[PDB]
Amino acid sequence: WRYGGDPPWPRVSPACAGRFQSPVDIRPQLAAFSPALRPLELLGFQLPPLPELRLRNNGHSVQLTLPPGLEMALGPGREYRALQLHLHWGAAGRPGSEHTVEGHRFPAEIHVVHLSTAFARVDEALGRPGGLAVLAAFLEEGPEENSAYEQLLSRLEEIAEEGSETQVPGLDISALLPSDFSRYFQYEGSLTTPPCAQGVIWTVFQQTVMLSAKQLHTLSDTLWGPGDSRLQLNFRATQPLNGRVIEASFP
Amino acid sequence: WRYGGDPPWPRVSPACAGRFQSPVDIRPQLAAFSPALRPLELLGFQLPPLPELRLRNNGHSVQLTLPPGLEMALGPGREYRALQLHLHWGAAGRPGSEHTVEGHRFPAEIHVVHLSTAFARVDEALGRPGGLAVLAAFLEEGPEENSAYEQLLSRLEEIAEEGSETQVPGLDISALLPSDFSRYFQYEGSLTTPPCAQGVIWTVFQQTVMLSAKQLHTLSDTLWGPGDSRLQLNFRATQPLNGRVIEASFP
Ligand SMILES: CC#CCN1C(=O)c2ccc(S(N)(=O)=O)cc2S1(=O)=O
Ligand SMILES: CC#CCN1C(=O)c2ccc(S(N)(=O)=O)cc2S1(=O)=O
Numbered sequence: 001w002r003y004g005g006d007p008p009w010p011r012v013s014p015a016c017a018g019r020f021q022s023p024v025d026i027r028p029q030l031a032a033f034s035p036a037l038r039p040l041e042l043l044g045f046q047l048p049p050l051p052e053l054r055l056r057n058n059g060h061s062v063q064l065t066l067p068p069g070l071e072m073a074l075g076p077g078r079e080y081r082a083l084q085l086h087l088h089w090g091a092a093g094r095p096g097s098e099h100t101v102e103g104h105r106f107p108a109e110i111h112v113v114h115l116s117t118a119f120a121r122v123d124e125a126l127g128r129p130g131g132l133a134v135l136a137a138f139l140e141e142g143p144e145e146n147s148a149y150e151q152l153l154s155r156l157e158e159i160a161e162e163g164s165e166t167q168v169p170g171l172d173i174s175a176l177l178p179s180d181f182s183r184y185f186q187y188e189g190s191l192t193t194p195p196c197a198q199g200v201i202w203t204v205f206q207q208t209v210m211l212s213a214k215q216l217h218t219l220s221d222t223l224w225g226p227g228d229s230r231l232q233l234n235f236r237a238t239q240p241l242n243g244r245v246i247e248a249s250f251p
Numbered sequence: 252w253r254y255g256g257d258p259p260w261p262r263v264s265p266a267c268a269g270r271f272q273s274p275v276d277i278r279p280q281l282a283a284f285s286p287a288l289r290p291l292e293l294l295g296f297q298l299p300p301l302p303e304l305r306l307r308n309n310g311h312s313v314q315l316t317l318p319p320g321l322e323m324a325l326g327p328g329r330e331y332r333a334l335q336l337h338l339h340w341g342a343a344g345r346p347g348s349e350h351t352v353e354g355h356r357f358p359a360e361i362h363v364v365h366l367s368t369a370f371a372r373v374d375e376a377l378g379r380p381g382g383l384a385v386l387a388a389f390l391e392e393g394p395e396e397n398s399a400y401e402q403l404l405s406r407l408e409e410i411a412e413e414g415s416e417t418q419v420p421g422l423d424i425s426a427l428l429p430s431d432f433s434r435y436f437q438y439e440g441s442l443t444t445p446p447c448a449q450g451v452i453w454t455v456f457q458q459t460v461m462l463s464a465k466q467l468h469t470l471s472d473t474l475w476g477p478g479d480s481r482l483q484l485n486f487r488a489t490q491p492l493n494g495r496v497i498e499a500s501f502p
């Protein structure tokens with residue numbers, strides 16, 4: 001399968017035509033204030049410089065392999081451990097966030113993928129409710145160079161070829177995420193690529209994160225995808241809610 | 252394991268010493284109104300007389316094994332299928348519900364235990380997020396007699412012995428529950444007997460079900476448990492929320 005260019009995704013993966021798919025369009029005034037949504041807890045994310053982390057070009061995105069010990073909680077006793085993170089982005093002049101807010105698509109989007117501590121392996125967790133949790137944040141253009149993201153973007157050139165990978169030194173993973181861990185949207189959806197497994201809890205931060213133009217450009221323009229072809233516009237059209245009510249941690 | 256004496260429940264099952272156990276004390280004052288909680292939807296609960304259902308005195312409760320085909324959804328994409336239902340009660344002039352409201356203990360309580368459609372069987376579901384779900388309703392003393400419960404209560408004589416069972420014709424299982432599926436409390440808890448696995452979603456109706464006084468005597472008076480003792484006060488001690496917030500489908 002490929003981003004923008006058949007095969008159609010149900011042909012390759014019928015799950016992708018399920019009723020509860022991701023990403024989705026967030027319409028904050030139809031979201032539901034749920035006071036029981038407490039602040040996110042992220043421990044162990046402040047990594048030292050060694051060991052090094054694997055950063056690969058998989059042709060569908062750039063992916064950082066996170067080590068054991070990144071622990072996350074959506075609620076009391078509802079804990080997770082981070083596996084990896086990756087990005088989604090547009091092209092020159094065009095946005096490529098997966099999730100949108102009232103129609104507005106953001107320049108790019110970070111996804112940090114976690115596994116319920118109730119499941120030992122990802123493949124037990126796939127398809128099961130709550131088995132996987134993704135923290136999503138939006139990246140926009142702001143006036144300043146973002147130093148947390150620079151640590152990755154400055155390494156993009158070395159893995160421009162589809163399938164190539166490099167070791168980067170450890171970074172503070174939490175530094176790539178927004179400021180208020182108490183302000184987010186949450187719904188249950190799916191993987192946004194095949195196999196499109198449902199049961200994924202999606203937490204989308206209410207706050208954005210700001211990158212320079214040199215940094216967003218670097219993100220879309222540096223990487224080569226499948227075929228003699230650029231890795232760009234690697235997002236999925238927003239999917240219908242089909243009766244799902246998006247929740248908000250804030251009024 | 253039993254209610255009143257040894258063995259102690261953590262010595263049986265380690266999970267019975269978990270932080271997030273059931274039952275709890277529902278203080279509506281502190282419940283988070285959550286407008287994403289829509290009305291519950293049952294399917295296939297209106298059973299014909301054949302096939303018949305096994306009703307058992309397992310020495311801890313009276314338990315009705317339910318057939319295939321009984322579908323329940325907590326909301327869009329949160330789908331379960333019913334396994335069994337059972338009862339908790341007190342004694343003469345003593346209440347026996349597991350859950351209490353602002354300290355109030357009700358005469359008895361019906362549990363309807365469900366399995367997430369993501370799991371083929373209970374052992375896969377235990378301890379997993381949302382793996383099992385229980386619908387709980389309180390039974391109160393009422394003026395007129397309940398004809399739905401008379402179908403079951405009239406058969407208790409036949410299973411007085413501990414470990415005995417009978418076969419009863421099918422019935423509207425939903426008529427054993429309140430008519431209002433829209434107004435409820437929801438929280439994440441445990442099973443209230445070993446192995447006491449967490450990750451269980453408890454939905455507690457605020458509408459009660461009404462049984463005549465004799466019916467409540469029939470329930471509490473008829474059955475025999477371990478030793479030469481009646482089966483009575485077969486509820487577990489109220490457990491602390493330990494930071495969990497109960498949600499409410501209504502303001
Ligand atoms: C099979 C398998 C697997 C692992 N994953 C994916 O394919 C996939 C696709 C999209 C995402 S995304 N856009 O975060 O949901 C995450 C994953 S994954 O769990 O790491
Ligand atoms: C192992 C196994 C099993 C099945 N179940 C239990 O042990 C248990 C305990 C308490 C309840 S209760 N009192 O409703 O929580 C229900 C079940 S069960 O799922 O049918």
Ligand SMILES: [Zn+2]
Nearest residue numbers: 086088111192
């Ligand atoms: Zn993604």
Ligand SMILES: [Zn+2]
Nearest residue numbers: 337339362443
């Ligand atoms: Zn019970």
